[PDB]
Amino acid sequence: GEEFRMEKLNQLWEKAQRLHLPPVRLAELHADLKIQERDELAWKKLKLDGLDEDGEKEARLIRNLNVILAKYGLDGKKDAR
Structure with a gap:
């Protein structure tokens, strides 16, 4: 459906596009969303089966x-003023 499968990666990436980030920026970000995507489904298999019982x-x-949101402040509070 969208660059990512879940609406969290889709909303995060598109959000970045709304922030008008530059291309290189949306490139590193997209890379982190894809890695976080495979990690979110693979882990979703974990949690669903009871693998992350330790967190x-x-x-x-x-x-x-938080690293991506920290590099693009797409959804994190880093402003001190």
Whole structure:
């Protein structure tokens, strides 16, 4: 349907496009969304089967989403003024 399968990667990427980021920027971001995508479905298999019972696998997905959102402030608070 969209560059990504879930609406979280789709909404994040398109969001970046709305931020008017430059091309190189949407390129590194898209790379992080694709890696976070395969990691979100593969992990979705984990959580669904009870693999991230420790919160480590699903945790890596959280840090990655914060890394992208941290590189594009697409959904993170970094402004101190």
